[PDB]
Amino acid sequence: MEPFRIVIPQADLDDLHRRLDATRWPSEIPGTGWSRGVPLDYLKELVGYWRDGYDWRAAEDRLNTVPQFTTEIDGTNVHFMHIRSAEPDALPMIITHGWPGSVAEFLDVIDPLTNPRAHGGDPADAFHLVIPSLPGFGFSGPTPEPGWNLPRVASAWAELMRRLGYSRYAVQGGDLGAWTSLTLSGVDHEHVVGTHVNFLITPPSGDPADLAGLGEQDLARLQLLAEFGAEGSGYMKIQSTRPQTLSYSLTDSPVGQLAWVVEKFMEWGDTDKSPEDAVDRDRLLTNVMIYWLTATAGSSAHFYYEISDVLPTAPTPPPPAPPLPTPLGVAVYPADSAKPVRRFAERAFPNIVHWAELERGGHFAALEQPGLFVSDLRAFARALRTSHHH
Amino acid sequence: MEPFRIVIPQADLDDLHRRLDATRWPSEIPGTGWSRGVPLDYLKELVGYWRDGYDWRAAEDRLNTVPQFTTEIDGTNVHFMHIRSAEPDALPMIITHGWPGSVAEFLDVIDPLTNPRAHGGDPADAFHLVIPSLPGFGFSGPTPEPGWNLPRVASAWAELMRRLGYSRYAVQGGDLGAWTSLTLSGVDHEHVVGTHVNFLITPPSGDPADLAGLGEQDLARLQLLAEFGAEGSGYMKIQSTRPQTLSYSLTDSPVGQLAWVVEKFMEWGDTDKSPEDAVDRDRLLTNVMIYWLTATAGSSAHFYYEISDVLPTAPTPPPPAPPLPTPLGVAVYPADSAKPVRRFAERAFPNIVHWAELERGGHFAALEQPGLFVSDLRAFARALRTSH
Ligand SMILES: O[C@@H]1Cc2ccccc2[C@H]1O
Numbered sequence: 001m002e003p004f005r006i007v008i009p010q011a012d013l014d015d016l017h018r019r020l021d022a023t024r025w026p027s028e029i030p031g032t033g034w035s036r037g038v039p040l041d042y043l044k045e046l047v048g049y050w051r052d053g054y055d056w057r058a059a060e061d062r063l064n065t066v067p068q069f070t071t072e073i074d075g076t077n078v079h080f081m082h083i084r085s086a087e088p089d090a091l092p093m094i095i096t097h098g099w100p101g102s103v104a105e106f107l108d109v110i111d112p113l114t115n116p117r118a119h120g121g122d123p124a125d126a127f128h129l130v131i132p133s134l135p136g137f138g139f140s141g142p143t144p145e146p147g148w149n150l151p152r153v154a155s156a157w158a159e160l161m162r163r164l165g166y167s168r169y170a171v172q173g174g175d176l177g178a179w180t181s182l183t184l185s186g187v188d189h190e191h192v193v194g195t196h197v198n199f200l201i202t203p204p205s206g207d208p209a210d211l212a213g214l215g216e217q218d219l220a221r222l223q224l225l226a227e228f229g230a231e232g233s234g235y236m237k238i239q240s241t242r243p244q245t246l247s248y249s250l251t252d253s254p255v256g257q258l259a260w261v262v263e264k265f266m267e268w269g270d271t272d273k274s275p276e277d278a279v280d281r282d283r284l285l286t287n288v289m290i291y292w293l294t295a296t297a298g299s300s301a302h303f304y305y306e307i308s309d310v311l312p313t314a315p316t317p318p319p320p321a322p323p324l325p326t327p328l329g330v331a332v333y334p335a336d337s338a339k340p341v342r343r344f345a346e347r348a349f350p351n352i353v354h355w356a357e358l359e360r361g362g363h364f365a366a367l368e369q370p371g372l373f374v375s376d377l378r379a380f381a382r383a384l385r386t387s388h389h390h
Numbered sequence: 391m392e393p394f395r396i397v398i399p400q401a402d403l404d405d406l407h408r409r410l411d412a413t414r415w416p417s418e419i420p421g422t423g424w425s426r427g428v429p430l431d432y433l434k435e436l437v438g439y440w441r442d443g444y445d446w447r448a449a450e451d452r453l454n455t456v457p458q459f460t461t462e463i464d465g466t467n468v469h470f471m472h473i474r475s476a477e478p479d480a481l482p483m484i485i486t487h488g489w490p491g492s493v494a495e496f497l498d499v500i501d502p503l504t505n506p507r508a509h510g511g512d513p514a515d516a517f518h519l520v521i522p523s524l525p526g527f528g529f530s531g532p533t534p535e536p537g538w539n540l541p542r543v544a545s546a547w548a549e550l551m552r553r554l555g556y557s558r559y560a561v562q563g564g565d566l567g568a569w570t571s572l573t574l575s576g577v578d579h580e581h582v583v584g585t586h587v588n589f590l591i592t593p594p595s596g597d598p599a600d601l602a603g604l605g606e607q608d609l610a611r612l613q614l615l616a617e618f619g620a621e622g623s624g625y626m627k628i629q630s631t632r633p634q635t636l637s638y639s640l641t642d643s644p645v646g647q648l649a650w651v652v653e654k655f656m657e658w659g660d661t662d663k664s665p666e667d668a669v670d671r672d673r674l675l676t677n678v679m680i681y682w683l684t685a686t687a688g689s690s691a692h693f694y695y696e697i698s699d700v701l702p703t704a705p706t707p708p709p710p711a712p713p714l715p716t717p718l719g720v721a722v723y724p725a726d727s728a729k730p731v732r733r734f735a736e737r738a739f740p741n742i743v744h745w746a747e748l749e750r751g752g753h754f755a756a757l758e759q760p761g762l763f764v765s766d767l768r769a770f771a772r773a774l775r776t777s778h
């Protein structure tokens with residue numbers, strides 16, 4: 001438990017610009033748009049801005065306005081932001097990012113969540129926030145040994161909240177952070193008072209009977225899963241099997257690191273022509289910079305290998321889980337890469353206290369739609385309070 | 391159709407050495423060996439040799455001892471080696487490499503196949519060789535448009551053989567070259583006299599009854615397929631879906647390009663502790679240099695996208711093909727990444743005339759075991775002459 005500040009040596013930035021200037025670009029097949037990955041023309045334009053335009057020092061300053069700390073847990077370094085609320089009886093909540101994200105995703109929602117009185121919110125709806133970097137990611141950095149899977153991350157987090165003195169807290173996440181949050185609600189069930197996910201997958205049974213009566217939208221959600229498996233799972237299959245092989249090119253090549261990550265902001269964000277439709281280029285590059293500067297493309301990929309058996313890329317599906325009794329909030333963003341079927345969600349989670357279908361935004365909710373994210377999490381906190389005393 | 395010679399600008403070599411010198415290495419998780427991909431200590435040592443000891447000019451010299459040509463077919467550049475036998479009666483054969491291989495794989499089998507008299511062979515077993523670079527690969531280079539799938543590549547080859555004046559020829563391949571050869575045997579059935587593959591997958595139906603009576607060795611071969619899908623197919627899934635995203639890092643980073651390729655030489659070769667157990671490092675780096683210097687990591691990856699529908703990684707597993715009538719030779723190398731169950735192969739190919747189970751070697755047969763490969767192909771020629 002020691003204070004932490006991001007201080008990037010100028011030498012690292014000079015090296016980055018050296019590499020950018022020396023980029024060797026591939027050929028392309030014309031007329032294929034985004035269908036086979038990041039198009040050449042777009043990436044050239046974004047790289048030009050990255051090299052001459054993007055301001056890391058300002059991003060660095062902004063990140064450093066948030067209190068950060070590091071601490072060692074279960075043999076590994078855990079970096080985390082901790083922002084105390086301006087209001088007494090605030091709900092402690094630990095928010096977890098996923099891949100290819102980072103703690104930078106949450107910069108625009110931290111102040112409205114923790115200080116609602118200064119952002120037109122109700123003081124009754126305040127949060128204390130703990131926002132940790134996943135082991136292997138960003139400023140937490142590489143893990144030293146095998147075995148950092150969902151329950152090991154969850155146990156680390158429970159220990160983090162214990163050290164911080166939160167005996168009662170909620171958990172929140174999207175992407176892999178949602179899976180970690182759901183896992184933690186079981187692992188630390190004595191201390192977790194509620195769970196909110198903005199990403200939820202509900203696979204079908206495989207029995208054509210459980211589809212009876214489902215409407216067009218729910219059937220389309222199931223189709224989205226199948227499409228993801230067929231077409232969108234490439235990154236997941238390679239990171240879950242040979243993350244180290246992949247890591248050499250992503251650690252050596254900043255354009256390669258950028259393409260690898262920015263593709264997902266295009267495909268999973270609420271976009272039309274460009275990833276910048278949903279996330280502006282400074283935020284896009286700041287997130288990529290956290291991967292690049294900490295050189296965590298590979299260590300973050302190893303997470304997928306550790307949890308390969310519970311991914312959709314698993315050979316055989318994991319056995320059906322017993323119901324998770326955690327009071328649950330679900331937020332469904334319309335451009336997300338996967339969306340839950342409520343009938344199926346009701347079976348797996350008997351205590352849903354909050355369900356919202358939002359009007360806009362994709363996979364990176366806090367970053368894409370901070371206003372909606374904040375309003376939704378407040379309504380979840382209100383629903384939690386309501387469900388506990390009635 | 392014009393003569394071709396490899397002449398790499400010095401500036402490209404200077405650029406490569408600058409990149410190698412400036413390599414930024416990743417973290418590792420110690421003690422995981424090769425289980426999660428190419429280990430850090432090994433690759434640092436290989437890159438050291440690449441930078442300090444490897445001699446591209448000598449490799450370039452050896453490649454250029456092979457007569458090579460380029461020609462435009464169906465809108466794309468096609469590079470190929472063409473080596474005539476001194477025996478006029480020789481069997482013409484087109485040999486196709488796969489991924490992450492190249493025409494450099496066959497340097498040690500060319501003279502024995504085309505001049506058997508000087509290399510322990512019978513003049514009756516001579517070949518004329520045509521050894522093309524796949525469209526999108528090596529010195530053929532990037533294709534200009536969508537659609538270069540197996541039938542389109544096969545058609546291009548039939549056209550190449552027609553242009554060379556070969557109205558009767560055999561086809562040979564491993565990896566994707568075997569799939570291309572099998573496709574070509576159907577596409578140009580009039581002119582293909584026989585097909586030899588040193589790579590063949592035989593998927594089970596999924597009906598438990600079809601496994602009845604199979605010995606433990608054949609059951610293990612089927613399980614090899616399952617293991618490949620589960621753990622070995624990462625490169626195939628990303629190249630078949632987002633090859634262009636992948637291409638940026640592989641085209642910009644020589645250590646990345648090296649890791650991406652050399653992993654398969656470890657996993658698919660007859661290896662123990664190192665890929666150099668099966669293929670020495672000069673040959674390994676020469677093959678990688680062909681990808682690096684032609685900047686074809688991306689365009690070679692696009693081939694997988696074009697054929698995604700027939701891969702193991704397909705959205706829906708491809709329906710079992712009807713039987714193919716081509717006279718077929720099959721060579722099974724014991725360390726290969728996949729190996730056929732003969733009972734199943736003979737249902738898919740009712741005219742198998744040659745079946746060899748070799749006792750050494752993996753996926754890169756001509757490169758790993760040139761002696762075994764030459765003997766087997768000569769045996770195949772003899773099987774074709776005495777059965778048809
Ligand atoms: O968008 C992706 C869809 C999916 C499915 C399972 C786990 C994670 C994820 C996301 O990364």
Ligand SMILES: O[C@@H]1Cc2ccccc2[C@H]1O
Nearest residue numbers: 565591618658702727728
């Ligand atoms: O790339 C090859 C294609 C394939 C198909 C089945 C098993 C292994 C393999 C690979 O060795």
